[PDB]
Amino acid sequence: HNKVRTCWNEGRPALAGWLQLPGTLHAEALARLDYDAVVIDMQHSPIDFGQVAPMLIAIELGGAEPFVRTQVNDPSDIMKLLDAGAYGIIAPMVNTRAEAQTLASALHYSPRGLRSFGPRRPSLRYGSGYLAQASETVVGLAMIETREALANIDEILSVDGIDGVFIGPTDLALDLGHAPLVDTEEAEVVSAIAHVRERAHAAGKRVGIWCGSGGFARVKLAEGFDFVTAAPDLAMLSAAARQVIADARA
Amino acid sequence: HHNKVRTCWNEGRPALAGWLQLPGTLHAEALARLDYDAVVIDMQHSPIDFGQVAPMLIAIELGGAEPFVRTQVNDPSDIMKLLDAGAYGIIAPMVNTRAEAQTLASALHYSPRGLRSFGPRRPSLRYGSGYLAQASETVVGLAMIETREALANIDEILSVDGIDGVFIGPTDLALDLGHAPLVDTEEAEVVSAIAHVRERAHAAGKRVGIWCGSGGFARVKLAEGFDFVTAAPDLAMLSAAARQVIADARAL
Amino acid sequence: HNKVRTCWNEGRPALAGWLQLPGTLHAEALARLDYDAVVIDMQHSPIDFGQVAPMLIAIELGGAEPFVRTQVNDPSDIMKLLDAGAYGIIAPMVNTRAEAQTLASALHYSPRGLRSFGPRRPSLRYGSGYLAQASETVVGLAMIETREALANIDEILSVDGIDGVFIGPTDLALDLGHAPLVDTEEAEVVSAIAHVRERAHAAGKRVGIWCGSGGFARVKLAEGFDFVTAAPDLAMLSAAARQVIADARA
Amino acid sequence: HNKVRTCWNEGRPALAGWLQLPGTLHAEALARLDYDAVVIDMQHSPIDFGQVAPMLIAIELGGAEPFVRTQVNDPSDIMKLLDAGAYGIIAPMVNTRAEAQTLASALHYSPRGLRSFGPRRPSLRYGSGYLAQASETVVGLAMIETREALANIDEILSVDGIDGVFIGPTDLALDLGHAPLVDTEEAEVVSAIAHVRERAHAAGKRVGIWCGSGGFARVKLAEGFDFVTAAPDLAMLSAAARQVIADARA
Amino acid sequence: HHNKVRTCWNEGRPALAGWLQLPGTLHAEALARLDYDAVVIDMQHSPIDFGQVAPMLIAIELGGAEPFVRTQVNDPSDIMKLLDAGAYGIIAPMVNTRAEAQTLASALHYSPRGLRSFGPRRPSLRYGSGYLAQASETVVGLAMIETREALANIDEILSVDGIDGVFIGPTDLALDLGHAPLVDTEEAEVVSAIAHVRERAHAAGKRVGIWCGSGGFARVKLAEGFDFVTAAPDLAMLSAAARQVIADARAL
Amino acid sequence: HHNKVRTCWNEGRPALAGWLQLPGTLHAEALARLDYDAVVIDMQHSPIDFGQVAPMLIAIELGGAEPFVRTQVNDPSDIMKLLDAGAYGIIAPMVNTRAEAQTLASALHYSPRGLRSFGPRRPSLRYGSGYLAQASETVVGLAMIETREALANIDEILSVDGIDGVFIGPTDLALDLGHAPLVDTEEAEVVSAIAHVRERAHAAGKRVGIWCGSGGFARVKLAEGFDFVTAAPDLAMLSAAARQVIADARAL
Ligand SMILES: [Br-]
Ligand SMILES: [Br-]
Ligand SMILES: [Br-]
Ligand SMILES: [Br-]
Ligand SMILES: [Br-]
Ligand SMILES: [Br-]
Ligand SMILES: [Br-]
Ligand SMILES: [Br-]
Ligand SMILES: [Br-]
Ligand SMILES: [K+]
Ligand SMILES: [K+]
Ligand SMILES: [K+]
Ligand SMILES: [K+]
Ligand SMILES: [K+]
Ligand SMILES: [K+]
Ligand SMILES: [Mg+2]
Ligand SMILES: [Mg+2]
Ligand SMILES: [Mg+2]
Ligand SMILES: [Mg+2]
Ligand SMILES: [Mg+2]
Ligand SMILES: [Mg+2]
C-alpha cells in the first residue's frame, strides 16, 4: 500500500522529508527515520532522472513512500517517474483547471487518464493485479505557488484525478510581492495559505505544504495540513555544519 | 596559490576540516564555503568512488577549502591519481610501520624525494607555471594511526621525512584495543594511547590530526593542541538534524 | 546505409530487438545476433539520455541499426538522439495528422523539416556528404496506440515525412477497454491491428508492431508487417531465470 | 559579477569558448585561457544535465563565466540550469516575439518573469542579497537561426527581458537554402548576419555569433559583435590530431 | 535481520543464487524477487565497477535476496568497502594458499577475529542497533578454488576459521588443468578435482559452493550436496533467450 | 579479426597511436577514425576511471583503431578486467624488474602461458568462436620503462617471453635521472638512455614504444625505428589549439 494514503485512510497526516542532494545513502537513512514519505526535489536541485532512479529504490527499502517534486507538469516525464517507482508526484505551476487536468491525465490509465502502460517497477512491487489498483498506489498533488493558482483554487480543486494541492510558500510569497522567506510570518502570505487549506478541505481534497523547520511543521500539522514536508537536506546539513564549526572554534 | 592547511600551520594554528561520506558536489561546495580550512572526502567508509570524488574536489576548491581525501588504502598509484585530480591532502589508512609510512611518502613527492609519477593535470591548472618548484609544499600527507601495532611503532612512523605527520582514528583504535567502537570514544586506555601519539608527534616536530564526531569533541582536541581536527561527518550531521526536525514536528 | 531501409529496399521485413535495461554489454551482444535493428526503449524503462548514448555506439558496433522509442514526440529530444547516432525513431502518442507532422519536422533538415544542424555522430559515420543523404539514413515511425490514432490513421499516414507507423498493442488494447495483454487474442484488438496494417500498406507506408514472443513475431512477419520487434530484454531475462530456478530446484 | 556583463559595462566585447565534449578537465583548462566565458552546448552534443552540472563548476573555478546553449527554449529546463550555476543562456529557435517572451519569462523572478525560486548555486556565489541582483547575474540571448527569426528580428529585439540575440549561422545558411558551412562567405548569409547585428545595435541590444575559426572571430569582433564564440572543442581537437598525424607520418 | 544464505545453511539446506554481469538495478531487483536466496554481482568478468555495484546492492536487498559480490581480487580494502555498502556475501578469486585465505578472513571480521575497519554505513541501517554484536554472522565469505595450487592446498585453505568455506570455479579450474574452458565442463580430471574439494570441505565442517552455467548442472550440484550453487549468468541467459526468440520469429 | 598494431608489426612497420586523458566517447571515436592504428586511453594521468573507460573502448573500436589502455598500475586483476572489456593493448607503469615484467605477462595470457582468468565478455563478441585459439595474439602488452632501475634492468625485462616489449616514458625518465620533467625532453643523458633501451629491445627481438608530446618528436622517433609511437595527448592538443584560436581572434 502507499504509506501516505494509509496515513490518510487511518485519519492521520503524513510527514515527509525533502531531498535536494543526489545519492542513495542519505535517502535510505532519512527514509528509516519517522518520515512517512521522502520527496526528491527534481526542480531546485541538480537531481536528474539518472540520479533519481536509484534514490527511489533506496527510499522504498528504508520504509518511506518515495515521492518526486518534478521540474515541470509534463505528462511523459511524470509517467517515466511512475514507472521507475515514484509513488507520489508534486507538480509545479499548476495554475489553472486545464493544467490540473494535464497532471491528472498522467496519473491514471485509460479510461480515467492517458498514462502509457509499461509499469516496470510498480509491477515488481504490486504484481499482476497492479492495473486494477494502480490509481490508488500513487498520490498526486498540484502545486499552488502563484497568484493565478490562488485565484483559480476552486477550479483546480474540482479536478477529480488529483488528490489535492501542495503549497509552495516561498514562491507564493514572491509572486504576491513579498520576500521568498521560508516559514514566513508575512500576514497576507499566512492568510493565503490558510485560505488554500480551507478551500481544499471544503472540496474534500488533501492539502500539503513545504516547511523549513520542525517548529513550523508542528504548527502546520496542528492546523490540519495532510502532507507536511520538513526540512530540505541541504539546509539541515548546512545549519548543522555551521553549528559544529562554531562549537569547535569556541 | 597555497595549501590552506599548511598556511594555518605556518601561522602556528590548527586547521579545522569537514568530513564527507555523501557523494555529490552541492553539499561539498556549500560546506567548503563555511569556516572550514579543508574538507576531507572519505573514500573508505562511504560509497564514494573515483568517478564521484573527482568533481567533488573541484567543488571544494571553488568553495574555498583545501580538498583532502581519506583513501581506502595506502596505495601509491591510487594516491598519485588523486593528487593529479586536485586532492591536496591525503590521509592514508592502516599505516602500521615505518615501511608503510615510507610507502605513503613515496607517492607524495617527485624524485628525488619520492617516486610520484609526473602528469599533474589539475595542480598545473591551479598553480600555473610555478607548480613543480613548490609541488611538495602544495600537498599535505598524514599517516593514519588506528591499531595497536601503529601505536607501538609511532616513533618509527614519525621518523619518515616525507610525511607531515599522523592522523588518529579513535573509533578504530578503540576497537583494535578491545573496546566498543564508539564515536568520540573516551575509553581510558584509548585516551592514554591518543595522548601518547600527540606527545610523540610534537616531540618529532611533526603534525598530529584526529577524527571527531562532534563539535564538542573537536573543541577539546583543538584545546589539547592537535594540528588538524575534523568534525563531523556529513551523513551523521544530516541524520541527527533530520531526527531533531521530526521530533520537533511531531511534538505535542 | 541504414540496415532497416536496406531490408525494405531488398523486399524483406526487419526484425528488431527491444531493450529496457540500460548498459552496453547486452546491447552489443544482442546486436550481434540475427537482429536487423535494436530498439532502445526510453519510455518504459529507466534509460535516460546519458545511458542511451553509449548503447547506440554498442549496437552499431555489433552490426544492427540503433533505434530509439522515445518518451515523447518532442522535436528537440529527437534531434539530440539523431545527432547521437539514433538511426531510427519510434515516437509515442502520435494521435493526429498535426502530431505526425511534428514528428516529421524533427527528422528532416530544411526545407523538408526544421532539424537543427550539428550531426556529431552521423557526420563520423557518413562523412561530409551526409547532408544530401541525411533523410534516408533515418527511419521514422509514428506510434499508433490510442483509439484516436486508430480513428485518424488515414490522416497520419498522409504525412510524407514519416516512413510509417508502429503499433503499440498493449496500450491500444487498454485504450479500447481491454486488458493490456502482450500478444493478445482479443478479437477487436486483433481486428484493429490488421486494419492499421492494411491502411498503411494501401497508403504505400511501412507498418511495425511490438511483440512479446517469437511465435507471435513469426505470425506478424507472415502477415506482412515491415518492422517486428521481439522481445523485451527484461521479460526474456526474467522468464529465462524462472526456468533456470525451476530446473535447479527440481 | 557576471564576467560578460562586466566586459559590456567596460565597453568591450566578450570572447567565449564552445564545448561539445562532456567532462570537467578541458572545461577548466579552457576557462583558464583568455576566454571571458565558456559555452557548454547541450544541443549538438551528448552533454545531458548530469554531465553539464560539474562542468559549470569547473568553468567557474577556471575563471570564465559559464554559459549554456540549451537544446530547447523551455522555461523549466532553463530554470534548472540557472539554479545549477549557468550564468548565461543561449536558447535555440527563438523565431517570434512570443518565443522571446517565453525565454525572458525564465530568466527573471516575479514580477518581471516567472522564474521559480530555489537558487542552489547562485545563492552560494552571491549570498542572501542574490534576489535583488539576480537578473543582472544572468545573460540571456535568443538564437536567430531561421528565416522566420530574421523576418521577425525587430519584434524579437523588442522584448525587454533578453539581452539580445545570438546568430547561429550554419542553421541560418541552411534555412536560407545554402550549405551549412562554418564561417561562410555566401553573400546572402553574410548580408543577413550584418542586418541582424545592425538591428540589434539600433534597438540597444547585444548581438553574438558562433564562429569556427580565430580569423573569422577576429573579423566579427572588428565588426562590433558583443559576444563571439570560437571554436568548438571537438573541431579544434580533430584538426589538431590530423595535423599531428600528418607531421608524424611525414 | 538475517543473512538469507546463512538461514538456509542453519536449516540444513543449500542456497541457490543468481549471477549478474550486466550493470543496473532493474534486472537486479527483478531477479532478486524470484526464488533465489542470493544474487551474486560479478565484479571480475563484467564491466561492473564500484559506482555501478552500489545501487545494485540496494535493489537486490529490496527484491528480497541476499546481495553477494564476486570481487575482482582478494584485496581487504576493496572487500571492506563492499561490506560497508551492503554486500553481505563475498566470493574472492584466486585464493591459492592458507595465507591468502587468512587475507580474505581478515577483511570480514572486526577485531579481535579480523581487522575490518569500522564504518558500516549500510549494515547499520539494515540491522540497526543490534548490528555490531552479530556483525560476523551477517556476512558470508567464500574463497575461490580455481587453480592447481588451490586444489593441492585445499585442506590448509579450509583450516582458516574466519571463512565459511570455498567456491569452485569449474571453467577456470579446467583451463588451469590443461583443458578447454568450457561452461559446465565435465572434463574427467576436473570432475574428480571438484568432488575432492567438496569432500574435503564437508570433512572440515565447512561450506562448498560452485558456479554453474545452467539450471540442469545446478540441479546435479545441488543433488551432490553443494551448499551454495549459482545459476546462471544474466548475460548468458539473456543472449540464449534472444537467440531462441529470433529462431522462432524467423522459422518457416 | 586482427589486432591492428600487430598487423603493422607483421608488415615490418611501426604503429602510430593517439593518447586520451579526457573521458568520453565522442572524441574517442572521432580520433580513432583518423590515421591512428591505435588509441591509448590513459588511466594514470587523467581522471578516467573504469566506468568511463568502458564505453570509450567501444567507441575506439567502432572508429577503427585498436583500443589500448595505459593503466594506473601493473596489477593483474585490473589488467584482466580491462582485457575482458575490450582493451586489446596494455601499457603498464613502473615495470622496473624482471619479476614485475613477469607479473604483467601473467595477466595477458591464459594458462599455460599465463594466469589470465577466463570470462572474455567483449573479446568473445569481437572475435567469435575463433577467440580462445588466438587469444594471446589479439592483445599487445608493453612494460613501461620510466626509472633508473628499469634502465639498469632492461635486458632482464626484455627476457620475459609473454610481453611484446617496452614503452618508454621520457618525461618520467628525465625526472628520475635528475632533470626537469619536460614534454619531449632532449636532455643528453635521457637521450642516451632511450637509445640504449631501443637498441637492447631490438637486440632481444622485442618491440619498443615511446610517448611523444608532438607530431615533430613522433616523426623523429618513427625515423629512429621505434615500433609504437604515441602522439599527442588530447588535452594538450586541445589546449594549444584553443590558445591559438584566442590569439588569432584577439589579434590586431
Ligand atoms: Br526519527
Ligand atoms: Br481555471
Ligand atoms: Br561557518
Ligand atoms: Br541469432
Ligand atoms: Br487528424
Ligand atoms: Br590564452
Ligand atoms: Br513576431
Ligand atoms: Br522463481
Ligand atoms: Br588523419
Ligand atoms: K519511515
Ligand atoms: K572555507
Ligand atoms: K545483427
Ligand atoms: K578566463
Ligand atoms: K528471493
Ligand atoms: K584508424
Ligand atoms: Mg504508450
Ligand atoms: Mg610515470
Ligand atoms: Mg539550430
Ligand atoms: Mg516554483
Ligand atoms: Mg580503519
Ligand atoms: Mg578466475
Secondary structure string (H, E, C) spanning chain A: CCHHHHHHHCCCCEEEEEECCCCCHHHHHHHCCCCCEEEEECCCCCCCHHHHHHHHHHHHHHCCEEEEECCCCCHHHHHHHHHCCCCEEEECCCCCHHHHHHHHHHHCCCCCCCCCCCCHHHHHHHHHHHHHHHHHHCEEEEEECCHHHHHCHHHHHCCCCCCEEEECHHHHHHHCCCCCCCCCCCHHHHHHHHHHHHHHHHCCCEEEEECCCHHHHHHHHHHCCCEEEEEEHHHHHHHHHHHHHHHHHC
3-state secondary structure of B196: helix
Sign of CA dihedral E38, E43, E46, E47: positive
What amino acid is encoded at F8 in this protein?
A: C
Interchain contact D15–F (C-beta under 8 A): yes
For residue C170, how many C-alpha atoms fall within 13 Å in the half-sphere facing its CB? 16
Ligand found nearest the CA of C61: 12
Distances (CA, A) of E242 to B123, B201, C170, C215, F19: 50, 64, 21, 13, 37
Q: From the CB coordinates, do chains A and F have 3 or more pairs under 8 Å? A: no
Closest chain B residue by Cα to residue D58:
B58
Closest chain F residue by Cα to residue E146:
F117
What amino acid is encoded at D92 in this protein?
A: P
The residues, any chain, with a CB within 8 Å of residue A15's CB and separated by 6 or more, are: A34, A35, A36, A37, A217, A221, A228, A229, A230, B246, B249, B250
d(CA D20, CA F188): 42
d(CA C10, CA B231): 70
Per the DSSP assignment, residues forming a β-bridge with C139 are C88
Contact predicate E88/E69, CB 8 Å: no
Cα of A24 from ligand 20 centre, angstroms: 23
Extract the C-alpha cell encoding D98: 512570443
Which of C128, C158, C37 minimizes the C-alpha distance to C90? C37
Cα of C76 from ligand 7 centre, angstroms: 21
Interchain contact D114–A (C-beta under 8 A): yes
Considering only the C-alpha atoms of chain B, give the largest distance between any 2 of them, rounded to a whole number of Å.
Answer: 68
The number of beta carbons lying within 10 Å of the beta carbon of residue E250 is 13
The residues, any chain, with a CB within 8 Å of residue F157's CB and separated by 6 or more, are: F95, F97, F98, F100, F101, F143, F145, F150, F163, F166
Give the DSSP H/E element, type plus range, for residue C104: helix C97-107
d(CA A174, CA A178): 5
What DSSP state is assigned to residue B91? E
Q: Report the number of distinct structural domains present in chain A.
A: 1
The residues, any chain, with a CB within 8 Å of residue C25's CB and separated by 6 or more, are: C58, E21, E22, E23, E46, E47, E235, F121, F122
The residues, any chain, with a CB within 8 Å of residue B36's CB and separated by 6 or more, are: A241, A245, B16, B17, B18, B65
d(CA F149, CA F154): 8
Contact predicate B121/B107, CB 8 Å: no
Peptide bond into B99 cis (omega under 30): no
Contact predicate F158/F204, CB 8 Å: yes
Q: How was this structure determined?
A: X-ray
Residue among F1, F2, F27, F45 flagged as catalytic: F45
Distances (CA, A) of B232 to B181, D235, F199: 16, 46, 58
Show the beta-strand stretches assigned E in chain E: 15-20, 38-42, 66-70, 89-92, 140-145, 165-168, 207-211, 228-233
Buried b (16+ CB within 10 A) or exposed e, E26-53: bbbbbbbbbebbbbbbbbbbbbbbbbbb
d(CA A91, CA A159): 14
Interchain contact F162–D (C-beta under 8 A): no
d(CA B47, CA F43): 21
The number of beta carbons lying within 10 Å of the beta carbon of residue F84 is 22
Partners of chain A (3+ Cβ pairs below 8 A): B, C, D, E
Per the DSSP assignment, residues forming a β-bridge with D89 are D68, D140
Contact predicate C85/C57, CB 8 Å: yes
d(CA A28, CA A30): 6
Contact predicate B132/B123, CB 8 Å: no
The residues, any chain, with a CB within 8 Å of residue A222's CB and separated by 6 or more, are: none
Cα of A120 from ligand 8 centre, angstroms: 18
Contact predicate F158/F200, CB 8 Å: yes
What amino acid is encoded at A146 in this protein?
A: T
Buried b (16+ CB within 10 A) or exposed e, C164-186: bbbbbbbbbbbbbeeebeebbeb
Which of B101, B90, B80 minimizes the C-alpha distance to B204? B101
Extract the C-alpha cell encoding F152: 639498469
Extract the C-alpha cell encoding D83: 539554479
Smallest Cβ–Cβ distance between C25 and the set E22, E212, E242 belongs to: E22
d(CA F109, CA F115): 6
Structural domain span for residue B179:
2-252
Pairing outcome for strands A37-41 and A14-19: parallel
Per the DSSP assignment, residues forming a β-bridge with D164 are D141, D206
d(CA A237, CA D125): 18
The residues, any chain, with a CB within 8 Å of residue E27's CB and separated by 6 or more, are: C21, C234, C237, C238, E20, E234
Which of D168, C137, C234 minimizes the C-alpha distance to A123? C234
Distances (CA, A) of D110 to A151, A173, E181: 17, 10, 69
Per the DSSP assignment, residues forming a β-bridge with A116 are none
DSSP states of D188-249: HHHHHHHHHHHHHHHTT-EEEEE-SSHHHHHHHHHHT-SEEEEEEHHHHHHHHHHHHHHHHH
Note which residues in 123-142 of chain A have CB less than 8 A from chain E: 124
3-state secondary structure of F166: strand
What amino acid is encoded at D55 in this protein?
A: M
Contact predicate A27/A40, CB 8 Å: yes
d(CA E170, CA E190): 7
Buried b (16+ CB within 10 A) or exposed e, A186-203: beebeebbeebbebbbeb
3-state secondary structure of D41: strand
Extract the C-alpha cell encoding F175: 625526472
d(CA F248, CA F5): 38
Extract the C-alpha cell encoding F143: 612494460
d(CA D214, CA D209): 13
Extract the C-alpha cell encoding A109: 490509465
- Cα F49 versus chain centre, distance: 17
- Closest-CA distance of chain A to residue B241, Å: 6
What DSSP state is assigned to residue B70? E
What amino acid is encoded at A15 in this protein?
A: L
Interchain contact D36–C (C-beta under 8 A): no
Left, alpha or beta for E86 (phi > 0: left; psi -120 to 50: alpha)? left
Q: Do E24 and C22 touch (CB under 8 A)?
A: yes
Q: Do E58 and A54 touch (CB under 8 A)?
A: yes
d(CA F238, CA F217): 18
Resolution (A): 1.2
With beta carbons under 8 A apart, name residues in chain A contacting B235.
25-26, 29
d(CA F137, CA F133): 9
The residues, any chain, with a CB within 8 Å of residue E197's CB and separated by 6 or more, are: E145, E151, E154, E166, E168, E208
Peptide bond into B232 cis (omega under 30): yes
**How deeply is F161 buried, as exposed, middle or buried, from its count of CB atoms within 10 A (0-12, 13-18, 19+)?**
exposed
Phi, psi of F138 (to 5 degrees): -75, -15
3-state secondary structure of F44: coil
d(CA F33, CA F61): 9
d(CA B26, CA A36): 26
Which of B104, B21, B92, B106 minimizes the C-alpha distance to B56? B21
The cell 583504535 sits on which residue? B173
Contact predicate A193/A144, CB 8 Å: no
Contact predicate A214/B249, CB 8 Å: yes
Mutate to test the interface with A, among D56, D76, D81 (most CBs of A within 10 A): D76
d(CA C227, CA C13): 6
Ligand found nearest the CA of D101: 7
The residues, any chain, with a CB within 8 Å of residue C185's CB and separated by 6 or more, are: none
Buried b (16+ CB within 10 A) or exposed e, D205-240: bbbbbbbbbbebbbebbeeebbbbbbbbbbbbbbeb
Phi, psi of F7 (to 5 degrees): -60, -45
d(CA B223, CA B238): 26
- Cα B166 versus chain centre, distance: 9
Smallest Cβ–Cβ distance between A80 and the set C43, C146, C175 belongs to: C43
Interchain contact F18–D (C-beta under 8 A): yes
- Closest-CA distance of chain C to residue D9, Å: 33
What DSSP state is assigned to residue E117? P
**How deeply is C215 buried, as exposed, middle or buried, from its count of CB atoms within 10 A (0-12, 13-18, 19+)?**
middle
DSSP states of D77-134: HHHHHHHTT--EEEES---SHHHHHHHHHHHS-TTTS---S--HHHHHHHGGGHHHHH
For residue E156, how many C-alpha atoms fall within 13 Å in the half-sphere facing its CB? 13
Buried b (16+ CB within 10 A) or exposed e, E86-112: bbbbbbbbbbbbbebbbbbbbbbbbbe
Cα-Cα end-to-end distance for chain E: 54
Which of F62, F58, F63, F67 minimizes the C-alpha distance to F20? F67
Sign of CA dihedral F27, F28, F34, F35: positive
3-state secondary structure of D11: coil
